[PDB]
């Protein structure tokens, strides 16, 4: 029905409906940021297993006017009451109140909109609110999610309330309706981001989290700040520059993978024969390994000094050092890539 090559603007989301919402936000004169936020709200509804206002995020944004990129940081934080030894198992760190970090998504949206928005706040929420009350058919992605977690969903009434039909998980095509989130979204549109963090919604969040055994308090919410990063991580790739977020995200690692690999000068020919394709793909995996080796040194750069670690990871020579240790005809033991921890 469509070539997916566009003359002026494009939105690529993991659900058609959210892509449209995005595009329609541009048509009505919204910026990239406006279209972005607008689409993510759609995505937190249509792919509810993936992301949403109960989470956190990162946004990389290029300003064509100022010819500059930036990063906005809205990943979740550990509660004031959290401590290093608070878990003793996987089971404990993955289910219930305690496995919940302080959500960031909403402060994220606010700052991005406060800096690059052209449409009103409430405009962004509008089509998602409609979608939530009316309901929509379940798409492939959320269908498999449901199937994958059938048992944990059906055995929990509060999930099954929205996610089951006759106490069985919804299947692809069946109608999902999200009545409680729609009200929520509407309160956010009217009252603003304040409603979530220090507002009409705050106490309910605390109670919900704590009732299931978390330790998140009002103070956590009240204090959460999204963060503007003026100088994102960058790497040179021939004619071009790549922008990406530094730690706590995986920019450094992707920087290393690509910096290692750009030294083989890959071309069309790298895959034109099985002989060369095999080698190419081997090199790729080895670079992964070498890059993952160094990952284990990374953390919040507000807590751990990783300044030099990152400068290294993205260094031109550091990359050249590891490339020379790649053998064309074999992989290696873990030890070989010198994974470090201090």
């Amino acid at each position: 029905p469509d070539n997916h090559v566009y003359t002026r603007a494009a939105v690529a989301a993991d659900a058609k409906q959210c892509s449209k919402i995005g595009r329609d936000a541009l048509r009505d004169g919204g910026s990239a940021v406006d279209a972005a936020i607008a689409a993510l709200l759609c995505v937190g509804l249509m792919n509810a297993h993936s992301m949403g206002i109960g989470g956190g995020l990162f946004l990389t944004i290029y300003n064509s006017t100022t010819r500059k990129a930036e990063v906005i940081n809205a990943r979740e934080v550990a509660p004031r009451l959290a401590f290093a030894t608070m878990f003793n198992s996987s089971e404990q760190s993955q289910k219930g109140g305690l496995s919940v970090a302080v959500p960031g998504e909403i402060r994220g949206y606010e700052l991005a909109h406060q800096r690059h928005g052209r449409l009103p706040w409430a405009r962004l929420f509008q089509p998602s609110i409609q979608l939530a009350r009316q309901g929509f058919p379940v798409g492939k992605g959320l269908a498999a999610a449901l199937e994958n977690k059938r048992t944990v969903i059906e055995q929990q009434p509060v999930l099954c309330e929205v996610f089951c039909r006759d106490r069985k998980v919804l299947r692809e095509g069946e109608r999902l309706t999200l009545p409680q989130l729609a009200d929520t979204y509407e309160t956010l549109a009217i009252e603003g981001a304040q409603a979530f963090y220090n507002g009409s919604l705050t106490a309910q969040i605390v109670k919900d989290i704590q009732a299931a055994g978390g330790i998140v308090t009002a103070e956590d919410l009240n204090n959460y700040r999204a963060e503007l990063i003026e100088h994102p991580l960058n790497i040179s790739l021939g004619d071009a520059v790549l922008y990406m977020p530094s730690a706590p995200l995986s920019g450094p690692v992707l920087a290393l993978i690509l910096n290692i690999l750009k030294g083989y000068n890959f071309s069309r020919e790298s895959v034109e024969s099985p002989e060369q394709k095999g080698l190419t793909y081997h090199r790729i995996v080895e670079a992964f390994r070498f890059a993952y080796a160094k990952r284990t040194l990374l953390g919040d750069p507000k807590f751990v000094d990783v300044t030099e670690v990152v400068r290294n990871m993205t260094s031109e020579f550091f990359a050249a050092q590891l490339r020379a240790q790649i053998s064309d005809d074999t992989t290696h033991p873990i030890s070989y890539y010198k994974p470090e921890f201090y």
Binding site: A9, A10, A35, L40, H49, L261
Partner: protein
């Protein structure tokens, strides 16, 4: 996890990645607000067990602290300051490998943006010590790894979800990942 790419008419762009962590997060949904919460604490390291990766002190929990993430939302820009690519990925821990493969398939192998997004993927993150491949990978690739002593194993489902937009002389080319079933929009 979800990623999306965006290109506005004025040539500005956003790469965005968002997550509640694992499928359905902590599996707590408010009966009042309907808000479904993240299990992002899982992403810190413990001084206890392996998932895998031994205790890594730079990622231990502290109050007010951000867990290390696998996510990498990216934008490539020409020397002439015009946007050339907006890409990223989502899905378990295969985010950073898939993103790189997407960039490589387009930038170096010369694949169109849709092929870049659909092309079979592979993954190794060192810890743990296995190379994983998608079920419809080129089998000559499999053999080449298996004879350079890689112990491969096929993925049951698929590796990651990629949303990209590339600049072409014909305009903006876009693709959403069929593995998760999205489609793009534009004008």
């Amino acid at each position: 996890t979800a990623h999306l790419s965006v290109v506005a008419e004025d040539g500005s762009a956003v790469s965005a990645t968002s997550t509640i962590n694992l499928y359905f997060g902590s599996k707590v949904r408010s009966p009042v607000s309907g808000i479904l919460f993240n299990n992002e604490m899982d992403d810190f390291s413990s001084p206890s067990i392996t998932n895998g990766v031994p205790p890594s002190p730079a990622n231990f929990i502290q109050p007010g602290k951000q867990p290390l993430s696998s996510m990498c939302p990216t934008i490539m820009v020409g020397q002439d300051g015009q946007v050339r690519m907006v890409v990223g990925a989502a899905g378990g821990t295969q985010i950073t490998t898939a993103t790189a493969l997407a960039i490589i398939y387009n930038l170096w192998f010369g694949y169109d943006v849709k092929r870049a997004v659909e092309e079979p993927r592979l993954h190794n993150q060192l810890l743990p010590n296995v190379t994983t491949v998608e079920r419809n990978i080129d089998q000559a690739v499999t053999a080449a790894l298996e004879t350079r002593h890689h112990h491969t194993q096929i993925a049951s489902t698929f590796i990651a979800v990629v949303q990209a937009i590339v600049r072409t002389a014909g305009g903006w080319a876009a693709a959403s990942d069929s593995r998760k079933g999205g489609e793009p929009a534009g004008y």
